Amino acid sequence: ALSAYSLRSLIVTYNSRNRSSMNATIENLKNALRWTSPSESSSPSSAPSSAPSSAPSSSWSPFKYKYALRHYVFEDHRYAFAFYDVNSVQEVVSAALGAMAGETCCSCRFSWRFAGRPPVSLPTPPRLVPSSRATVLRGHCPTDKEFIRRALEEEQAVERIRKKLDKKQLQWFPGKTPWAP
Amino acid sequence: EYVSMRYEGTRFNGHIPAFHLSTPRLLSRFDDAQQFQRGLKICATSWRRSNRRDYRPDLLGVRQEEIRTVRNFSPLEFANFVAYYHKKKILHEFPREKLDYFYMLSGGNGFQARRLLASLYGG
Amino acid sequence: VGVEDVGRFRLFDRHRLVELLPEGLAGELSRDVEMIPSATSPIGVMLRKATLELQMQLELFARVHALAAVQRGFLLDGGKSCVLNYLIPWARENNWLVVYEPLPSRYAREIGDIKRSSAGVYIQSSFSQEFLERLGRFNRRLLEELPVARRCYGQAALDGVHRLYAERSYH
Amino acid sequence: SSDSALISGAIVRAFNPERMKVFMHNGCEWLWQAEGTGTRKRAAAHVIIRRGTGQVRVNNDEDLYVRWPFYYNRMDVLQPFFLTGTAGIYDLFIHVRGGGSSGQAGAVRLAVGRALVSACPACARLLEEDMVLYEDTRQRMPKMPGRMKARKMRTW
Amino acid sequence: RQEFFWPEKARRTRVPLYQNSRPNLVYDQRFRRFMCMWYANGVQVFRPFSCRGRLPDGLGIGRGSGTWERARAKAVVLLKQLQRQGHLDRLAKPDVTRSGVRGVYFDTEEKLWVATWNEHGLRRFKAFPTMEMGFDAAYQAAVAVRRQKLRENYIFSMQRNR
Amino acid sequence: LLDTGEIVPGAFASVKKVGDFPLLPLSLLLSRLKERRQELLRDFAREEERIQRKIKILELLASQGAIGDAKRIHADAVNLLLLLAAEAETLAEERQLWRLKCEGNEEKWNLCISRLKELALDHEDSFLVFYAMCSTNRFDAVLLPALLERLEASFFSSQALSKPLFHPIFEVWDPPCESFAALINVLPLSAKAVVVTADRRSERERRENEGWLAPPEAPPLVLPNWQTMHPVDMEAWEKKQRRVVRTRHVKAKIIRQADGRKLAATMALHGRQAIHRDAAVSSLVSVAAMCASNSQRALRGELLPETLNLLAAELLGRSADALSPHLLSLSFLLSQSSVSLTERLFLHLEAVLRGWLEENGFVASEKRRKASEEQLRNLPPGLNVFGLVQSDTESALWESRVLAALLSSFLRVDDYRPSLDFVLLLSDALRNSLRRTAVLHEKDVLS
Amino acid sequence: CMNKKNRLALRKRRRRMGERVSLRYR
RNA sequence: GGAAGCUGGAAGACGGAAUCGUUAUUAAGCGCCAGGUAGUCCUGGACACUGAAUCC
RNA sequence: UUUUUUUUUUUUUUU
RNA sequence: CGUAGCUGUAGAUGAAUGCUAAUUAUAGAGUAU
RNA sequence: UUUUUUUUUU
């Protein structure tokens, strides 16, 4: 049922081409917090994604026998964030997009969950007689640790399956099969 | 190592299986040990002529209750082996200080112990 | 001898060992004996724990024949061949007919002869003679004394195939 | 016996209860369990020491001579044990990921060396003779561009 | 006989030759051959023993047995022949080089005695000085380091005629 | 001897037997030590070390006695256990003073365990602790596995036969010698079964009687935060350190060793040789316990059925006088395994039951009282049986438990018919009237 | 793959995939 | 144009003379791919393992 | 691990 | 991953790999001996 | 540089 859905998690990722631009986004995102209605604001976790780089090659002045070369480095930066138990969608989605500055795109990943049959059993227990014959830190997520462990395992399972299937359907000249003609 | 025309396409590249011969087949049947009312048979395999790999014991004739899996020599037995060679004038000088040091090197294996001590002076 | 004596070396006479094992030493022991410079030195074999468990079974098997005793072969998997240098000589000393064959592959990776037949089993005339010649070196004086049954006279083919199984090829 | 009360009474509970298992004062003075890490070339290592006179297993339940068939390689990953006298007392577990044949052997020497010092501060001065704690952070130089196919391979 | 050939397509080993306790003995790992070292007149000469494969059925000792232990058995019998007969046992009057033993060289920038040697890829330098000990005490200590360090790792160094 | 200068080969025909006949407690041993004090004193840097410590313990043993605990609660923790262990075994207006001393010993005995486990015992102290518990019949399911490893590693050590005795004087007045080499070889057969029949289960094992239980496999849950997050510019972070700290994920796991199973296999072979020696019935009970293992021996070798068949063959051919007393222990262990020689063995054991109960007065209450006591404590050395009857107030309180377990043992068989229907009615009626007079109170109620 | 280095690589690569290619010359 | 089966008696054991240079994870060997927008090099670019010696 | 295995190692990652 | 270790063959006087009646793959087209 | 199996051998 549509009304039974709930945003389980929202992985927010960033891709910045400059060091200063990425730092500005972190400060902007933090400022948006500590201002919601609930006592503890949503505190997402950090997860760096390395820093890919690329640098092509070219011969170097024309009319030369390739004695020198000139390279052009093109670095990059990435950042990923994790969310759990996003009760307020307006106070999270708006804050993430509003923290951008300059050429810093984003890529969200929603994750819903549907509940089955609500377990409702164990009525008032029977009884007889013998016959005589708080603790919340400052910069920490308020969600329970048990919920994160259950959701974290699911993410690791989907990543393994996608990589295995993607490798199978990866060959040169798509649509070619042996002794098909 | 024989060659013939009994290959199943590419199963042997035109070779005669060893178990298909006369003499090897006579000593390649363990399930017939029940007919031996006088005695019994026994076999062992320890050399490196071929990689054992999985070495399925169920599809060969023996059972899981008749396999004796030995282990590496214990430290007590290792000391005796070294001392035995000394009486034979095999080694030159084997100080007691390095007696236990060599145990970790070869791991106590018989094949690795005799070869390691033979190449070097030992100890 | 017993549980108290484990991992000890038993001296063996050079001359007595050759007679007891005319074919040769069990396993790769021949590579370790040549290293000794002394020619009159004895040969020693370690008594591993694996031999004690196997030796006890043989003792009970002999006494019964005079369903508790084992009536099947064993298998050593994993120093598995080291015990053969001590179990065979001991059994032969107790009036036991032991078939010795440390190198059975010699009849399959050497110069020989093969003749195809209808039974589908290749024979080796050259290697067939060596099997009996080597077995009779030490097992003599007993085969001749042993009688021969009359119920198994001649029901084997030229290639050793049974009459019932050989005639099936012509069906 | 008042001196022992202040020393033995402080190690228990309080700051660090891990240091509670010892083998007398003289002769072993080694901790029950220890850890060490070593890095050499494009590889890493994680060696842990535990009480026991068992064999040596690297990974995937295999022997030691399989990874290092050469004699010189096996001696380098066991030099500290001989000097310290722990030839047949403590176990050895080597875990590595990446590198080469002799590249992984060097990482073990640094990893195991840093574990013995933690288990016994006193048993660290004698290991400086062979330069066990010394490492090599330097790596291979890059291939310069231009005409030289290799680092300094000239051409006609 | 004194040529140290290095095959192109082969595995490089850190210690090609392994030193043994016996003076007149050395094991070669490159060709898995056993050799004996002795000074003859002036030069080092060896007697390589074959270890490759190809008979009586009594015992696998001697004759045509293509076993790795044949070379070891052939070396022990030959060692006693030289000592018993006393043909060639005599000290190496042949010198190594100008700077005493091999591997030791004098310093050019000042008075020092450098003794370089590899050990598990590492190396040492500096060694002992010469001005603080003269040209006699310092020289004696320089040679003592090489001989002492070679007895632990079992490293054999070939002596060159020049 | 042969003419070639060697031992005659005919001598090596059969296998020798084992002893393990004598068995004494730690009570009479101390009395002899206190008498031979003037003769034991007759006996380099290390010269003083082996003498200074070696004599201080002799005078003390006879740390201020059995008083001054807590504060005092190294070999100090080991010698203290001997005083407490020996004091408890001494038992085997008046109930007021005695209870005060008995309670103190029990409370202090358990307290010493906490400090003992926190420190790994040496080879010279592991055996002493284990031996003391056997005499006092006070084992631990948590401490037994830990001490079993030490006795195994040192047993197979290179310096086993050449090494001299341990310096505690306990080994001086001992039959065996040669340090731990021959000490364990002459171990009583009663104590040998403990190693083989050792429970290696943990507390998490609850999927058999309790119910469902999901075990965890991820204690550590490392989660980052905002205050301890790595900076964006990680390249400069590595340049601000003295040495390499962060490294690829490389962690080494722990591999379990034999855990004492290697030593147990050697001990199992000793019981096999002690069957065809025509020994006492009490000594033969230990052989069955080892052969009836379910978690150590497994079925690697084909020796379990062979040993069991031989044991049954010798047991069948025995007089009823020596077999009647020993019926609960033998039947309890022999019923846990199935073999071909099962029906024949049980038929003989059933006949003696008819005469045993009839002669004891079972269908003059002193005949039935003394008989039960011998079967409950005297016979069973350290065994723990169905419902934990293990080695009387008014009437029919202790004897009922013995009879309750006996019936279940005969009905456990899985080879043929347990017994006759007539026997069941007779057996049921035997205890029917006995349980009627079982005091219709206190904690002494059948749980 | 003109030289003996690159050309022999193709034959060795196929040997690890469950095929047998003669090796011998080149 | 690239590779492969079969077949195979293409031209080579000459010269210890001489010219191109390496500041040690240098030198000497061996193995892998990224781009060149279908295939298409023994050169160039780029990574990893074994890795000795000398008076520089 | 005495009913356990049946074995060579790479150039990004358990944040 | 390659020279592995290990281990069978001939401890090669004879291991040079180009020439071609003939097919494998990309491409719209690379064909004739 | 290459392993057996769906059953018809006293």
PDB file of N, CA, C and O (backbone and C1' of nucleotides) in Angstrom, chain E residues 8-9 11-14 97-98 102-103 105 118 123, chain H residues 24 27-30 49-56:
ATOM      1  N   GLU E   8      70.083 -16.048 -18.644  1.00  0.00           N
ATOM      2  CA  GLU E   8      69.130 -14.970 -18.898  1.00  0.00           C
ATOM      3  C   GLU E   8      67.755 -15.316 -18.329  1.00  0.00           C
ATOM      4  O   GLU E   8      67.242 -14.623 -17.459  1.00  0.00           O
ATOM      5  N   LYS E   9      67.166 -16.416 -18.796  1.00  0.00           N
ATOM      6  CA  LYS E   9      65.846 -16.881 -18.369  1.00  0.00           C
ATOM      7  C   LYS E   9      65.999 -17.809 -17.170  1.00  0.00           C
ATOM      8  O   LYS E   9      66.109 -19.027 -17.313  1.00  0.00           O
ATOM      9  N   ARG E  11      65.314 -17.782 -12.484  1.00  0.00           N
ATOM     10  CA  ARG E  11      64.921 -17.087 -11.264  1.00  0.00           C
ATOM     11  C   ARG E  11      66.156 -16.577 -10.535  1.00  0.00           C
ATOM     12  O   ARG E  11      67.065 -17.347 -10.231  1.00  0.00           O
ATOM     13  N   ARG E  12      66.178 -15.278 -10.232  1.00  0.00           N
ATOM     14  CA  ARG E  12      67.276 -14.672  -9.478  1.00  0.00           C
ATOM     15  C   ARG E  12      67.177 -15.052  -8.005  1.00  0.00           C
ATOM     16  O   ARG E  12      66.125 -14.968  -7.387  1.00  0.00           O
ATOM     17  N   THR E  13      68.273 -15.471  -7.409  1.00  0.00           N
ATOM     18  CA  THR E  13      68.300 -15.863  -6.001  1.00  0.00           C
ATOM     19  C   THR E  13      69.215 -14.923  -5.242  1.00  0.00           C
ATOM     20  O   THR E  13      70.272 -14.529  -5.736  1.00  0.00           O
ATOM     21  N   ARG E  14      68.821 -14.559  -4.024  1.00  0.00           N
ATOM     22  CA  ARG E  14      69.605 -13.661  -3.182  1.00  0.00           C
ATOM     23  C   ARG E  14      70.939 -14.264  -2.753  1.00  0.00           C
ATOM     24  O   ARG E  14      71.920 -13.546  -2.611  1.00  0.00           O
ATOM     25  N   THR E  97      92.740  -9.275  -3.483  1.00  0.00           N
ATOM     26  CA  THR E  97      92.818  -7.980  -4.158  1.00  0.00           C
ATOM     27  C   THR E  97      93.775  -7.083  -3.379  1.00  0.00           C
ATOM     28  O   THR E  97      94.395  -7.498  -2.397  1.00  0.00           O
ATOM     29  N   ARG E  98      93.926  -5.838  -3.818  1.00  0.00           N
ATOM     30  CA  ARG E  98      94.779  -4.852  -3.175  1.00  0.00           C
ATOM     31  C   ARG E  98      94.314  -4.522  -1.769  1.00  0.00           C
ATOM     32  O   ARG E  98      95.124  -4.439  -0.851  1.00  0.00           O
ATOM     33  N   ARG E 102      88.137  -9.554  -0.360  1.00  0.00           N
ATOM     34  CA  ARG E 102      87.112  -9.022  -1.245  1.00  0.00           C
ATOM     35  C   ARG E 102      86.028  -8.321  -0.451  1.00  0.00           C
ATOM     36  O   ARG E 102      85.641  -8.755   0.630  1.00  0.00           O
ATOM     37  N   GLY E 103      85.519  -7.246  -1.021  1.00  0.00           N
ATOM     38  CA  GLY E 103      84.441  -6.451  -0.478  1.00  0.00           C
ATOM     39  C   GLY E 103      84.850  -5.281   0.393  1.00  0.00           C
ATOM     40  O   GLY E 103      84.013  -4.451   0.736  1.00  0.00           O
ATOM     41  N   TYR E 105      87.157  -1.894   0.728  1.00  0.00           N
ATOM     42  CA  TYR E 105      87.790  -0.841  -0.035  1.00  0.00           C
ATOM     43  C   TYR E 105      88.064   0.360   0.851  1.00  0.00           C
ATOM     44  O   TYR E 105      87.317   0.656   1.782  1.00  0.00           O
ATOM     45  N   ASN E 118      75.338  -6.941   2.068  1.00  0.00           N
ATOM     46  CA  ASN E 118      73.887  -7.014   2.050  1.00  0.00           C
ATOM     47  C   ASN E 118      73.383  -8.029   3.067  1.00  0.00           C
ATOM     48  O   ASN E 118      74.015  -9.057   3.314  1.00  0.00           O
ATOM     49  N   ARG E 123      71.572  -2.974   4.224  1.00  0.00           N
ATOM     50  CA  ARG E 123      73.025  -2.856   4.157  1.00  0.00           C
ATOM     51  C   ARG E 123      73.506  -1.933   5.252  1.00  0.00           C
ATOM     52  O   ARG E 123      72.735  -1.139   5.798  1.00  0.00           O
TER      53      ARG E 123
ATOM     54  P     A H  24      74.284   5.574  -7.615  1.00  0.00           P
ATOM     55  O5'   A H  24      72.742   5.279  -7.939  1.00  0.00           O
ATOM     56  C5'   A H  24      71.808   5.044  -6.898  1.00  0.00           C
ATOM     57  C4'   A H  24      71.094   3.708  -7.110  1.00  0.00           C
ATOM     58  C3'   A H  24      70.087   3.368  -6.013  1.00  0.00           C
ATOM     59  O3'   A H  24      68.842   4.032  -6.167  1.00  0.00           O
ATOM     60  C1'   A H  24      71.461   1.490  -6.489  1.00  0.00           C
ATOM     61  P     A H  27      67.372   1.418 -14.894  1.00  0.00           P
ATOM     62  O5'   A H  27      68.670   0.499 -15.108  1.00  0.00           O
ATOM     63  C5'   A H  27      69.823   1.004 -15.753  1.00  0.00           C
ATOM     64  C4'   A H  27      70.946  -0.036 -15.753  1.00  0.00           C
ATOM     65  C3'   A H  27      70.557  -1.367 -16.397  1.00  0.00           C
ATOM     66  O3'   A H  27      70.675  -1.361 -17.813  1.00  0.00           O
ATOM     67  C1'   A H  27      71.701  -1.727 -14.335  1.00  0.00           C
ATOM     68  P     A H  28      69.601  -2.150 -18.713  1.00  0.00           P
ATOM     69  O5'   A H  28      69.795  -3.672 -18.257  1.00  0.00           O
ATOM     70  C5'   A H  28      70.988  -4.384 -18.541  1.00  0.00           C
ATOM     71  C4'   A H  28      70.918  -5.811 -17.995  1.00  0.00           C
ATOM     72  C3'   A H  28      69.726  -6.603 -18.524  1.00  0.00           C
ATOM     73  O3'   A H  28      69.969  -7.190 -19.794  1.00  0.00           O
ATOM     74  C1'   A H  28      69.921  -6.860 -16.166  1.00  0.00           C
ATOM     75  P     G H  29      68.738  -7.627 -20.727  1.00  0.00           P
ATOM     76  O5'   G H  29      68.024  -8.783 -19.877  1.00  0.00           O
ATOM     77  C5'   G H  29      66.719  -9.218 -20.204  1.00  0.00           C
ATOM     78  C4'   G H  29      66.225 -10.257 -19.190  1.00  0.00           C
ATOM     79  C3'   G H  29      64.718 -10.486 -19.267  1.00  0.00           C
ATOM     80  O3'   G H  29      64.362 -11.419 -20.275  1.00  0.00           O
ATOM     81  C1'   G H  29      65.408 -10.205 -17.005  1.00  0.00           C
ATOM     82  P     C H  30      63.219 -11.082 -21.317  1.00  0.00           P
ATOM     83  O5'   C H  30      61.889 -11.496 -20.538  1.00  0.00           O
ATOM     84  C5'   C H  30      61.676 -12.817 -20.083  1.00  0.00           C
ATOM     85  C4'   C H  30      60.790 -12.835 -18.833  1.00  0.00           C
ATOM     86  C3'   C H  30      59.414 -12.230 -19.045  1.00  0.00           C
ATOM     87  O3'   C H  30      58.534 -13.144 -19.671  1.00  0.00           O
ATOM     88  C1'   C H  30      60.370 -11.406 -17.042  1.00  0.00           C
ATOM     89  P     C H  49      56.657  -4.249  -6.603  1.00  0.00           P
ATOM     90  O5'   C H  49      57.066  -5.732  -7.052  1.00  0.00           O
ATOM     91  C5'   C H  49      56.537  -6.881  -6.423  1.00  0.00           C
ATOM     92  C4'   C H  49      57.132  -8.167  -7.007  1.00  0.00           C
ATOM     93  C3'   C H  49      58.647  -8.278  -6.848  1.00  0.00           C
ATOM     94  O3'   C H  49      59.047  -8.773  -5.581  1.00  0.00           O
ATOM     95  C1'   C H  49      57.979  -8.827  -9.075  1.00  0.00           C
ATOM     96  P     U H  50      60.572  -8.630  -5.113  1.00  0.00           P
ATOM     97  O5'   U H  50      61.401  -9.642  -6.031  1.00  0.00           O
ATOM     98  C5'   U H  50      61.416 -11.032  -5.802  1.00  0.00           C
ATOM     99  C4'   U H  50      62.471 -11.709  -6.674  1.00  0.00           C
ATOM    100  C3'   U H  50      63.867 -11.112  -6.490  1.00  0.00           C
ATOM    101  O3'   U H  50      64.584 -11.646  -5.382  1.00  0.00           O
ATOM    102  C1'   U H  50      63.342 -11.424  -8.822  1.00  0.00           C
ATOM    103  P     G H  51      65.296 -10.654  -4.337  1.00  0.00           P
ATOM    104  O5'   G H  51      66.398  -9.924  -5.244  1.00  0.00           O
ATOM    105  C5'   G H  51      67.396 -10.653  -5.932  1.00  0.00           C
ATOM    106  C4'   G H  51      67.947  -9.838  -7.105  1.00  0.00           C
ATOM    107  C3'   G H  51      68.587  -8.515  -6.703  1.00  0.00           C
ATOM    108  O3'   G H  51      69.944  -8.652  -6.324  1.00  0.00           O
ATOM    109  C1'   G H  51      67.076  -8.180  -8.507  1.00  0.00           C
ATOM    110  P     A H  52      70.518  -7.798  -5.091  1.00  0.00           P
ATOM    111  O5'   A H  52      72.095  -8.089  -5.150  1.00  0.00           O
ATOM    112  C5'   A H  52      72.600  -9.414  -5.075  1.00  0.00           C
ATOM    113  C4'   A H  52      73.637  -9.662  -6.172  1.00  0.00           C
ATOM    114  C3'   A H  52      74.899  -8.802  -6.050  1.00  0.00           C
ATOM    115  O3'   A H  52      75.850  -9.290  -5.094  1.00  0.00           O
ATOM    116  C1'   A H  52      74.094  -8.791  -8.292  1.00  0.00           C
ATOM    117  P     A H  53      76.689  -8.247  -4.181  1.00  0.00           P
ATOM    118  O5'   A H  53      77.756  -7.663  -5.231  1.00  0.00           O
ATOM    119  C5'   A H  53      78.738  -8.482  -5.816  1.00  0.00           C
ATOM    120  C4'   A H  53      79.369  -7.851  -7.048  1.00  0.00           C
ATOM    121  C3'   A H  53      80.296  -6.686  -6.754  1.00  0.00           C
ATOM    122  O3'   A H  53      81.620  -7.061  -6.384  1.00  0.00           O
ATOM    123  C1'   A H  53      78.758  -6.122  -8.469  1.00  0.00           C
ATOM    124  P     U H  54      82.448  -6.099  -5.386  1.00  0.00           P
ATOM    125  O5'   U H  54      82.976  -4.942  -6.356  1.00  0.00           O
ATOM    126  C5'   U H  54      83.795  -5.163  -7.480  1.00  0.00           C
ATOM    127  C4'   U H  54      84.027  -3.874  -8.251  1.00  0.00           C
ATOM    128  C3'   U H  54      84.709  -2.782  -7.444  1.00  0.00           C
ATOM    129  O3'   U H  54      86.115  -2.930  -7.333  1.00  0.00           O
ATOM    130  C1'   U H  54      82.851  -1.924  -8.630  1.00  0.00           C
ATOM    131  P     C H  55      86.868  -2.465  -5.999  1.00  0.00           P
ATOM    132  O5'   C H  55      86.750  -0.867  -6.032  1.00  0.00           O
ATOM    133  C5'   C H  55      87.026  -0.101  -4.882  1.00  0.00           C
ATOM    134  C4'   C H  55      87.288   1.361  -5.200  1.00  0.00           C
ATOM    135  C3'   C H  55      86.251   1.994  -6.128  1.00  0.00           C
ATOM    136  O3'   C H  55      86.028   3.351  -5.773  1.00  0.00           O
ATOM    137  C1'   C H  55      88.400   2.099  -7.074  1.00  0.00           C
ATOM    138  P     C H  56      84.586   3.833  -5.262  1.00  0.00           P
ATOM    139  O5'   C H  56      83.807   4.162  -6.621  1.00  0.00           O
ATOM    140  C5'   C H  56      82.396   4.295  -6.625  1.00  0.00           C
ATOM    141  C4'   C H  56      81.883   4.877  -7.948  1.00  0.00           C
ATOM    142  C3'   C H  56      82.343   4.094  -9.183  1.00  0.00           C
ATOM    143  O3'   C H  56      81.333   4.135 -10.184  1.00  0.00           O
ATOM    144  C1'   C H  56      83.124   6.319  -9.285  1.00  0.00           C
TER     145        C H  56
END
